[model samples]
Target chain A: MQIFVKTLTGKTITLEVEPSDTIENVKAKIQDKEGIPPDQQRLIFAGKQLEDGRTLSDYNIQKESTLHLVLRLRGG
Target chain B: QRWLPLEANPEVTNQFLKQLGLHPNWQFVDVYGMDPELLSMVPRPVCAVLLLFPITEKYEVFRTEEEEKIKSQGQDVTSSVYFMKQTISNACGTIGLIHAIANNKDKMHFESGSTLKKFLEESVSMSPEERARYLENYDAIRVTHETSAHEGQTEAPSIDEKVDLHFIALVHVDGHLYELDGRKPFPINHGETSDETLLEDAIEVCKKFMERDPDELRFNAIALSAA
Candidate 1:
């Protein structure tokens, strides 16, 4: 299935993956393509955060789904 | 800990709500003024009213004191009223929108399998704190909010940027007017209110915010009603 990832800067990154792929796997793909480490990424789909251990189908993510990629923030 | 702040524009907010499954028959309209003439121009059957205002030291003091007073006196809030605490900074806009729709579900319709519908259904039995946590993980609303934030005429601010403006919603539930602010511990019951009087009653509260901040000119209001 094909999905779209939207960034805060208004950029959309498209990726192709299977419904059985875990969120961590998708983040790894993002890391390979965009150089963003998996730990630094926060993926949101349908207003819910995607868990690393859960698969795309677990969250009802399907073809043409748009996931929002937000950078993780570290502060006090 | 924070999401992008949403603009107070009606066009932007209406779009945001629609994208979340709000039917096209309903929309948000600006309340240009608090006077009778200005209020007459707004469409009727206003379900909810949202106010965006500058958060000043004076208002903070009042908010703190009011919460304390309510804690001691215990105002009666309808059990059916849908309320949530806001855990994400700059998320008050979306929280206000949720408060508006969650309380008036019977009066509104939603698209099947929509993000808002699913979130509301799952969080119906959750406590205020649980609802906040659910929203924190809910990316669809956040994503929609980010998109709408950028669509405004003004350039959207960064997520890390500090914003002093705050948004609060006023809704009528169970014959009472309730002010739903996520920053507050609970909903504030203002007084008796009916569907026909919600807009005017809510505007009265907004006027008080202006009266308290006499020198501040950054107050704006929008009402959710039939298009």
Candidate 2:
């Protein structure tokens, strides 16, 4: 399946994933493509924070869906 | 407050060094692959390697393991090691850059009355937290930092946006290889290192980090070397 990620910096990245893919898996791809660390990236879909180890289907994501990515503020 | 952003380009890093009245001997050339052949071409006698890695949950897990390792093995952090707390967000790059240069002052010349030298003079015996407090008062470096944030692929984080970025310095101190993460409670004494072995020793630690996050391809490593 395909999905779109809109970064906080106003850039959009397209992703290819499966319903069985874990959020961590998607995050790894994002880390490779966007250069943002997986732990530092916060993914939101349908008003909820995506949990690692959970599959896309668990989050009720579908094809052509959109996920929002916000880079977390690091350190005090 | 939103964090002051910085693109991890070595050119901007050189600019930051120049702002601190230090010669721009450091170059952040591409060592993205870290192959043995590529690493060999990165000049010699590298003083320090500054690694920029993502602060992912897996990293946190690794950090927890290292923290426990420190507690179990009783790792010793020398008092003479130069360390500082990161009081402000997004200042890690600047902090790490300072760490790379400051620790090698004996081999390099820092301009008199420069922020780097002045900070060293006033920060003697001061706690890491105190050093961070004093860093906030450095208007020249701070301004240059803000200016550099806008160059290349970075922008000043909007007031409403949060920036998730951090930097740490790795250098040999007191016969030990120390990782100077401004966010850590204290410097981590990884192991021993000598001038001849510093580059290889530090890269070994960096490879360990890469193994911990086997899937991560976003990590960057830059070295500060004598020109």
Candidate 3:
């Protein structure tokens, strides 16, 4: 249940998440951990949105079951 | 092997920054003129290209190391944003690795190209909106049907393309391999600008880089690829 977050600045952070948590939960947590403002942050895997409604189990999570909390940099 | 010389590397004053680094990070502040192809790849509309930033932190170092690893393993690793656009065939596949080139301190700032403006201006003649249509309108682009539409997720059986390739060029220096300036004219020295223009630019960029400077910036011994 550990997800590693990589910031746009290339910094990375690690956190544990349960199936109960949503993408939003991970977002808020990672934004603080990575010092990214929460204003318009997003979670994308490949080129698709890591929907706020889904859990990690739904997607093809990479090694370490790592859900990338990549900083959703643009878009308002 | 084509390259556009910067003061030492290629000039940021012109062209897009996509080949050597990841598509601009959407900090909502820095790096603009987000190329339309990149816009689709980005999860969101990114505003920051963060061009001149250097890696001063461990994470940044690690990221660069990953790119180095790819080159050590004999994988092609970098290119320009425009080249990536042409090469990224809509076939659900990505060719090389994407790395964060600049740091937050040097997040690429948004800038436009005069040549690009001029190119479009020539086409539009008098209408600015017409230029936007040519630059941003996806429909206006002619799709090379060879690249399948279901490109993002589909895997293709590998076929070896001829390598004596003359079109675009990339470089691997001290473990940092990047796509050199492919679109710009070659032998791109400072051009009657400075006695040490080309060499100086290379030296300056190396000074800022943690690895590969001065002596290592040579791409096939001259700027641009052999055609």
Candidate 4:
């Protein structure tokens, strides 16, 4: 499955994930691509938080749809 | 929301202005040179001018000397002048943005959730230092600021690095010109300006700044204009 991760800065990066990959696994991919730590990433899909234990399909994530990422520590 | 590491540029500042609820008519234009003809090309009447310039120990010396001179002479800072101190290290651009907006709020219809308006609603009664602290923690505004910084790639100077650049605003308020610099103790009143000669009057102020460091000419000026 392909997922598009969008940042508030208007940066979007597409990632390919296996059907059975855990959200944590996809988060790792995002962490690598976005330079954000997996622990600090808050992935919101359909206004719902994606749990580490669930697979993309479990949350019914659709391709070409954007997942918003909010960083844990923003500007001071 | 991660530490707002964004730098402010013409593009980023314009986006930041929109996010702060400036109507489309209000905008920014790159001022190539301070020539009257160059400034005339931008839509007017310009409400404010934000200057981005290089800072140095030498400039700091000039600022200190000028600051004391202004103080000894006494500033005409009035209650009508809205001022705020800069609490965060690299948030000067946003602070300049706020100064530009806050001074002009009466003429603007702030969007329902404007970060700038929301900040004023809460910080209106706070002292300059307190207002700075207030902005240091406001999440909505912080996120927007961070996003702009990231998009502009004008990243903040790291902890160990020396900050060499800063932003300041020059606004026309209550029939007088005031320099709203977050790093200053209070707004510096630059004397009388009518709606007609604000640009010409402000350029004089900018010229004084350039004179303070005769060899340095990297000054940039942009206008916050009426829509």
User: Best candidate per DockQ, number?
Assistant: 4
Q: What interface Cα RMSD is found for model 1?
A: 9.0
Identify the leading candidate in terms of lDDT.
1
- Full ranking by DockQ: 4, 2, 1, 3
lDDT of each: 0.87, 0.73, 0.31, 0.76
B1-227 per-residue lDDT for model 4 (tens digits): 12343454566678777777666677777776677887787777888888877786677998898799987888777786778998788778788888887887786677767778888889888889998888888988876775555444333334345556778998888899998989888898888997677777888888888887788867778877765
Which CAPRI category fits model 4? incorrect
Ten contiguous residues minimizing lDDT sum, candidate 1 chain A? A67-76
Give the winner by DockQ: 1 or 3: 1
DockQ of each: 0.04, 0.05, 0.01, 0.08
In order, the candidates keep a fraction of the true contacts of: 0.00, 0.04, 0.00, 0.00
Identify the runs in model 2 with alpha carbons over 4 angstroms from their true place: A1-76, B153-156
Model 3 lDDT at residue B203: 26
Question: Please, what are the lDDT tens digits per residue for candidate 1 over residues A6-38?
Answer: 876558989999999999999999998899999
Once superposed on the true structure, which residue ranges of model 1 sit more than 4 Å away at CA? Answer: A1-76
RMSD of each: 9.4, 10.9, 19.1, 8.0
User: What tens digits encode model 3's per-residue C-alpha lDDT throughout A5-59?
Assistant: 5433323468777766777677778666655555335555554557777766566
Give one digit per residue, the lDDT tens place, for model 2 in A1-76.
8999864223468999999989999999898886776765667786467888799999889999988764442221
Global CA lDDT of candidate 3, please? 0.31
* Better TM-score candidate (2, 3): 2
